[PDB]
Design a protein around this ligand. Structure first.
Ligand SMILES: COC(=O)CCn1ccc(=O)[nH]c1=O
Ligand SMILES: COC(=O)CCn1ccc(=O)[nH]c1=O
Ligand SMILES: COC(=O)CCn1ccc(=O)[nH]c1=O
Lengths: 237, 300
């Protein structure tokens, strides 16, 4: 069934599993035409697929050519997502394949279920948590690879870096989800927090600043601090 | 005009014959139903006065044999049996007919309701849905489950309706997932009509039989099947024109006949709103949409 705060530990047990977020698959800019009408121009997208135990993120890049000549793109995007997830699962051996796929938006349930009919033993589940995987394109190296793609492409990066050398998956998912959640509420502030210190380097090979344990505690506090404020600034509290 | 003689009426019971019904008192001198129109299937059904639980009944066709109803006190129900002595049958019927111990199938001459509800229903197909091969008639009741229901528990007492499942490999061609799920024309025309039912008359016959079992017995699995067969047509972009026009007629008379007080349980809001207002065929069912809007506007 649905995944919520009560079964918030199942994510880190030993059933190989991935989450699927489709919020960045079909992306457009809206603009005026010469005649004064409105049109859309698609830009590259990605499906944010995340192993929340290991942090592996399969950023299947959706090149704008996939929309060419198609109608009802917002509907197609959900079926394109399900097709690509199904293809991903099929490329793996059975033992390497996951046991559950959790979709972040309920509208993905039917497309994925239909694409996964060949896999009756893989549970397709919704969730009630408000998960911040739409903010994945606020991560500079992820946005860069999506925007540079000239063809369909798979960009698989472990979003936990080497964080699992020092902390548990539960904590790693908590750090990642708070980092992502902050970026969604106020991207500029969140990014300032993360880079305000020039001596801490997002190493070339990692998506996150090489913080020490103590520095991560400060960063996390600053991010929870941002989310708090924006909540007030939004509601005036 | 044929006859179903009754050996007696030892327990108080409401007896239905097709869309008609009448109350028989305990040990009343009731000995059957006469003037039954030849050419159609019929259903004779029962609701005991003391136990409104379990409506039950028998589908039959008087062209296929001489049938009588005898209360069995051990099993506690009105059974239908076949008389194999044609001389006994004529003698027993004539006897009861001369003493005026039978009710007359009370059809109005203008009234084509029963024909319209059973146009495509044949006994031979009923007997494949209700498997009891030693009888020429078929027993159904409120509690019998369908083969599809049993997959999600007595197989001999099941309704063997054709399994329809929109999220199944039968319904969805590999590589056409989105196309086949959002437009079920393949599943309707190739899998069901060409492959399984062979023609639209057999499809409509099962649809009509499912509705009648839902209406007369409150059989939940039958109601599921009726709605699934409607939804499969309405969710197909490509349906033969004669099929759409015939479905409109079929549903019109089903909706006309439904008791106004049973519409809350026999009609599925989602299916009907989808079929009438959202589906490919939302503009193809003019007669059904008009009677639904004037009779059950609350549902919509
Ligand atoms: C479906 O696979 C996954 O969710 C991640 C599997 N995995 C584990 C360890 C590793 O080094 N690389 C990798 O790809
Ligand atoms: C204090 O941080 C946490 O408790 C992480 C959990 N979390 C965070 C952000 C979010 O959108 N969803 C979520 O489940
Ligand atoms: C009046 O006698 C009986 O009713 C005997 C029982 N019975 C009833 C009807 C019939 O066709 N054959 C038969 O044997």
């Amino acid at each position: 069934g649905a995944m919520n705060s009560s079964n918030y530990a199942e994510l880190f047990n030993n059933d190989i599993k991935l989450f699927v977020d489709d919020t960045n698959v079909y992306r457009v800019t809206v603009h005026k035409t010469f005649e004064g009408n409105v049109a859309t121009k698609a830009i590259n997208g990605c499906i944010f697929t995340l192993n929340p135990k290991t942090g592996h993120l399969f950023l299947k890049i959706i090149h704008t050519s996939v929309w060419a000549g198609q109608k009802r793109l917002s509907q197609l995007a959900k079926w394109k997502t399900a097709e690509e997830v199904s293809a991903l699962v099929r490329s793996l051996p059975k033992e390497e394949q996951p046991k559950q796929i959790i979709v972040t938006r309920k509208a993905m349930l039917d497309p994925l279920e239909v694409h996964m009919l060949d896999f009756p033993n893989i549970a397709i589940r919704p969730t009630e948590l408000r998960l911040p995987f739409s903010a994945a394109m606020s991560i500079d190296k992820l946005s860069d690879v999506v925007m540079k793609a000239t063809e369909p492409q798979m960009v698989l990066f472990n979003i936990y870096d080497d964080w699992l050398d020092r902390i548990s998956s539960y904590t790693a998912f908590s750090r990642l989800t708070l980092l992502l959640r902050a970026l969604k509420t106020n991207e500029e502030s969140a990014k300032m927090i993360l880079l305000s210190d020039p001596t801490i380097t997002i190493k070339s090979y990692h998506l996150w600043p090489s913080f020490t344990d103590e520095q991560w505690i400060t960063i996390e506090s600053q991010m929870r601090d941002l989310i708090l404020t924006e909540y007030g600034r939004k509601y005036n509290v | 005009m044929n006859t179903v003689p009754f050996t007696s009426a030892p327990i108080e019971v409401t007896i239905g014959i097709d869309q008609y019904s009448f109350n028989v008192k305990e040990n009343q001198p009731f000995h059957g139903i006469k003037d039954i129109p030849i050419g159609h299937v019929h259903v004779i059904h029962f609701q005991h006065a003391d136990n409104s639980s379990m409506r039950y009944g028998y589908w039959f066709d008087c062209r296929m044999g001489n049938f009588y109803i005898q209360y069995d006190p051990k099993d506690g129900l009105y059974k239908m049996m076949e008389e194999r002595d044609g001389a006994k049958f004529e003698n027993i019927v004539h006897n009861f007919k001369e003493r005026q111990m039978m009710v007359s199938y009370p059809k109005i001459d203008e009234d084509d309701t029963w024909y319209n509800l059973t146009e495509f229903v044949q006994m031979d197909k009923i007997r494949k849905i209700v498997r009891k091969d030693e009888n020429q008639f078929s027993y159904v009741d409120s509690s019998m489950t369908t083969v599809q229901e049993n997959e999600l528990s007595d197989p001999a007492h099941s309704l063997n309706y054709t399994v329809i499942n929109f999220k199944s490999r039968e319904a969805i061609r590999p590589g056409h997932e989105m196309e086949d799920f959002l437009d079920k024309s393949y599943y309707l025309n190739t899998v069901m009509l060409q492959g399984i039912f062979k023609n639209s008359s057999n499809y409509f016959g099962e649809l009509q039989f499912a509705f009648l079992n839902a209406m007369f017995f409150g059989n939940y699995g039958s109601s599921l099947q009726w709605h699934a067969m409607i939804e499969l047509i309405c969710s197909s972009a490509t349906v033969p024109k004669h099929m759409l026009d015939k479905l409109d007629e079929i549903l019109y008379y089903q909706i006309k006949t439904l008791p106004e007080q049973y519409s809350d349980i026999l009609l599925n809001e989602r299916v009907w709103n989808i079929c009438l207002y959202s589906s490919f065929q939302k503009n193809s069912l003019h007669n059904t949409e008009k009677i639904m809007e004037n009779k059950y506007p609350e549902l919509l």
